Amino acid sequence: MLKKKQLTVLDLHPGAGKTRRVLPEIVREAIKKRLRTVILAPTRVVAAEMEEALRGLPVRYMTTAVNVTHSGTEIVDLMCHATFTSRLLQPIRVPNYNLNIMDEAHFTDPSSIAARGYISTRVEMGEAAAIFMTATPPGTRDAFPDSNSPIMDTEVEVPERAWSSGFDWVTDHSGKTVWFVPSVRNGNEIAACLTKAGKRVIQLSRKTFETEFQKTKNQEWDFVITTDISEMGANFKADRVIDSRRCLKPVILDGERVILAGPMPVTHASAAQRRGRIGRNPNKPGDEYMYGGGCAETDEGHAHWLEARMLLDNIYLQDGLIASLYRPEADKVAAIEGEFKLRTEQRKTFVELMKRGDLPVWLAYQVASAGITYTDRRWCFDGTTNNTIMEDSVPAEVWTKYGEKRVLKPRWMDARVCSDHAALKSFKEFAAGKR
Numbered sequence: 002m003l004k005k006k007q008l009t010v011l012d013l014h015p016g017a018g019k020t021r022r023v024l025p026e027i028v029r030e031a032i033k034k035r036l037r038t039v040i041l042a043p044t045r046v047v048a049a050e051m052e053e054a055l056r057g058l059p060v061r062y063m064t065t066a067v068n069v070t071h072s073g074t075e076i077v078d079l080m081c082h083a084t085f086t087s088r089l090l091q092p093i094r095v096p097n098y099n100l101n102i103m104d105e106a107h108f109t110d111p112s113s114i115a116a117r118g119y120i121s122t123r124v125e126m127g128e129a130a131a132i133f134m135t136a137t138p139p140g141t142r143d144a145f146p147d148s149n150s151p152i153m154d155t156e157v158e159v160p161e162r163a164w165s166s167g168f169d170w171v172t173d174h175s176g177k178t179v180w181f182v183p184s185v186r187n188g189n190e191i192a193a194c195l196t197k198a199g200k201r202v203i204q205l206s207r208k209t210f211e212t213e214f215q216k217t218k219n220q221e222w223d224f225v226i227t228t229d230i231s232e233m234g235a236n237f238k239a240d241r242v243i244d245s246r247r248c249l250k251p252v253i254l255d256g257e258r259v260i261l262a263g264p265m266p267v268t269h270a271s272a273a274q275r276r277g278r279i280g281r282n283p284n285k286p287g288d289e290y291m292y293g294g295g296c297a298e299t300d301e302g303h304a305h306w307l308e309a310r311m312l313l314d315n316i317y318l319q320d321g322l323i324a325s326l327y328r329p330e331a332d333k334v335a336a337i338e339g340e341f342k343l344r345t346e347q348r349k350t351f352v353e354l355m356k357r358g359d360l361p362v363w364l365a366y367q368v369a370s371a372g373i374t375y376t377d378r379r380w381c382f383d384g385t386t387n388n389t390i391m392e393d394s395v396p397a398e399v400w401t402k403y404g405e406k407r408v409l410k411p412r413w414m415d416a417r418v419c420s421d422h423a424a425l426k427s428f429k430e431f432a433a434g435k436r
């Protein structure tokens with residue numbers, strides 16, 4: 002696999018041992034051949050599990066998830082997918098790695114799609130080798146892959162709201178369940194219903210993931226309520242998965258606003274990874290997977306693939322050349338390579354709006370391409386009245402950096418800035434000039 006000019010997809014089934022058994026053997030062989038190598042983890046939780054699997058090997062951990070200081074003897078670097086893309090965008094030199102390994106290579110966040118595009122382009126150029134590790138590669142149509150032990154698959158109506166009757170099987174269970182919901186707000190309602198019924202519930206989402214995931218190891222629980230972030234290598238000691246089979250889809254409308262459409266069906270890859278949380282113990286057959294809908298190609302026209310092109314158009318490759326998306330996912334967006342390439346100062350604003358501003362890629366691009374500088378927040382208040390952000394059914398208000406109370410009405414509306422209480426609180430702080 003390690004031969005230059007080749008991309009290998011390591012598609013062993015979930016729980017086959019890609020991370021704990023295969024990855025250390027690849028790393029040893031890469032060090033034996035003096036290959037400068039990068040290992041890309043989807044999250045800090047996976048970065049910490051990888052350190053345990055690679056312990057003793059000379060790996061430089063470029064993440065605060067692992068308490069290990071580098072010694073300079075390392076030619077293998079390990080970082081998150083988002084950190085790789087961030088360092089490529091920033092004015093810092095990233096080594097031209099001979100071997101590029103991406104774990105949980107199915108991740109559809111924009112920075113992970115961009116990282117696959119950049120790496121696969123370097124392989125196409127004949128400059129590098131790559132290994133993408135995932136049971137569910139782009140375009141997979143199999144929601145029921147192999148597992149370490151047999152799973153009981155059952156199609157059943159799954160609640161998406163609080164209930165008083167008709168779903169006794171949910172609460173009659175005496176084991177541990179991982180339940181995938183389409184949004185944080187939907188999980189809050191289901192969690193409250195379960196807590197009122199006497200269950201112990203932990204909730205996971207992208208913004209709370211490292212902190213709350215530790216609770217699944219440190220205390221007893223009956224349910225974990227989680228969004229799709231748990232499809233990325235999160236391991237639980239569970240015997241049942243309840244899967245709504247639904248997700249939200251960010252969609253750009255008329256090139257001028259982003260809505261969160263749905264909930265709508267998940268892809269086959271997501272359904273296989275959600276199911277893949279159980280059936281992992283060869284000595285415990287009969288884990289249950291209850292699923293509440295079918296699968297569909299909901300990654301087609303999904304904003305993340307247009308946002309990955311915005312990132313790739315702004316990464317230096319070679320002169321004016323621009324990296325393409327990885328071939329099996331290149332048709333998910335109608336976009337021309339290079340259409341989002343920004344001039345020097347606008348590119349710097351675009352990067353800072355994402356890195357420090359914590360804005361979605363699409364929204365950071367609208368601001369930067371309009372020639373607005375990072376600290377100028379006048380655009381948060383001068384949009385049309387239909388762009389008014391609401392807080393508990395009344396227009397949201399903030400004190401601007403000038404000390405005036407104003408209604409939040411952004412020039413460009415991206416539903417991701419106000420999709421839950423935490424997102425809206427963060428956007429109000431941004432509008433106020435607090436970061």
Ligand SMILES: O=C(CN1CCNCC1)Nc1ccc(F)cc1
Nearest residue numbers: 061062063064065071080081084
């Ligand atoms: O960049 C980091 C850590 N950094 C990652 C993402 N942002 C927050 C923390 N460490 C590093 C270690 C060794 C090196 F040689 C270079 C960088």
